[PDB]
Design an enzyme around this catalytic site. Structure first.
Site, PDB file in Angstrom:
ATOM      1  N   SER A  49      72.763 -47.174 -30.850  1.00 17.25           N
ATOM      2  CA  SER A  49      71.812 -46.779 -29.726  1.00 17.25           C
ATOM      3  C   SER A  49      70.481 -46.552 -30.043  1.00 17.25           C
ATOM      4  CB  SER A  49      72.765 -45.945 -29.017  1.00 17.25           C
ATOM      5  OG  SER A  49      72.156 -46.031 -27.467  1.00 17.25           O
TER       6      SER A  49
ATOM      7  N   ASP B  51      79.373 -54.222 -22.937  1.00 17.29           N
ATOM      8  CA  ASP B  51      78.799 -52.904 -23.151  1.00 17.29           C
ATOM      9  C   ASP B  51      77.973 -52.668 -22.059  1.00 17.29           C
ATOM     10  OD1 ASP B  51      76.779 -50.858 -23.943  1.00 17.29           O
ATOM     11  OD2 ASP B  51      76.798 -51.328 -26.095  1.00 17.29           O
TER      12      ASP B  51
ATOM     13  N   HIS C 158      80.611 -49.490 -25.708  1.00 18.56           N
ATOM     14  CA  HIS C 158      79.234 -49.187 -26.271  1.00 18.56           C
ATOM     15  C   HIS C 158      79.659 -48.296 -27.578  1.00 18.56           C
ATOM     16  CE1 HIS C 158      74.957 -48.181 -26.619  1.00 18.56           C
ATOM     17  NE2 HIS C 158      75.576 -46.662 -26.523  1.00 18.56           N
TER      18      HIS C 158
END
Length: 265
Positions: A94, A215, A244
């Site tokens: 991320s 996701d 995710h």
């Protein structure tokens, strides 16, 4: 070097090959615990917490300094410099995928390979670009985070995990609740105002992009966009699982991909 204690730096495993594991929003380095044994026989693995992790003393979170991702990059480079590591592979989830991209542009010789998980160069939509969220959508989220963090967190955790894996929802919720709510909002805002599309072409490190089936924050089209516009050799690896946070929900599937991607660099 003061940073080494502040950001809870740990080095485990053995060998010439160094691998850095850099976590994303809402967790700390413990999120890597289950994939970690697949790497430590073959690699020297560097783990650390982002300054925003609940596991870091909130005394250290400088809102004005960490107003942009370059400040996080500074920390990463400072850690590697303090450890006297001139070459490594970097695995980022991320926000850490963005940190990795920026860092590899800053110091091309330092990053021999990038592995990007839950990754996007921009989470907001733009004309013809699908990031996953309209401005209004994330503003509604930020409103909720600010009004009642606990209520927001409880609602977000299963969406992030995606797959119906209660243990991962529980574990993600644990570290999500460990964050101070104002720091949590701040980091999210910083991520959503970041746009790396313009500089993807400057990257020269080989890159593996890990894609899951769905996701909530990363549309399926983002991986191909990264492959098309990154300036190094880029391969998309397809992980047969939803969510995710595959290092939490599908650590077995993920670990085998990591093994292949970190076998040589």
């Amino acid at each position: 070097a003061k940073l080494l204690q502040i950001l809870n730096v740990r080095v485990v495993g053995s060998g010439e090959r160094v691998v850095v594991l850099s976590h994303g929003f809402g967790t700390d380095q413990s999120a890597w615990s289950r994939v970690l044994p697949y790497l430590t026989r073959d690699h020297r693995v560097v783990l650390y917490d982002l300054v925003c992790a609940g596991s870091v003393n909130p005394d250290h979170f400088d809102f004005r300094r960490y107003d942009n991702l370059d400040a996080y990059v500074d920390d990463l480079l400072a850690i590697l410099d303090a450890l006297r590591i001139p070459r490594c592979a970097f695995v980022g989830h991320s926000v850490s995928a963005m940190i990795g991209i920026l860092a590899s542009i800053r110091r091309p010789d330092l990053f021999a390979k990038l592995v990007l998980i839950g990754a996007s160069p921009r989470f907001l939509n733009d004309s013809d670009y699908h990031g996953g969220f309209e401005l209004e959508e994330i503003q509604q989220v930020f409103d909720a985070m600010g009004a009642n963090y606990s209520a927001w967190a409880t609602g977000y955790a299963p969406l992030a995990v995606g797959a119906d894996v209660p243990a991962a929802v529980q574990e993600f919720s644990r570290t999500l609740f460990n964050m101070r709510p104002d720091i949590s909002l701040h980091v999210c805002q910083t991520v959503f105002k970041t746009d790396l599309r313009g500089v993807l072409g400057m990257v020269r490190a080989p890159c593996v992009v890990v894609q899951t089936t769905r996701d909530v924050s990363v549309p399926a089209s983002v991986a191909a966009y990264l492959k098309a516009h990154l300036g190094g050799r880029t391969t998309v690896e397809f992980l047969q699982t939803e969510g995710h946070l595959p290092h939490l929900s599908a650590p077995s599937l993920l670990a085998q991909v990591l093994r292949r991607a970190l076998a040589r660099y």
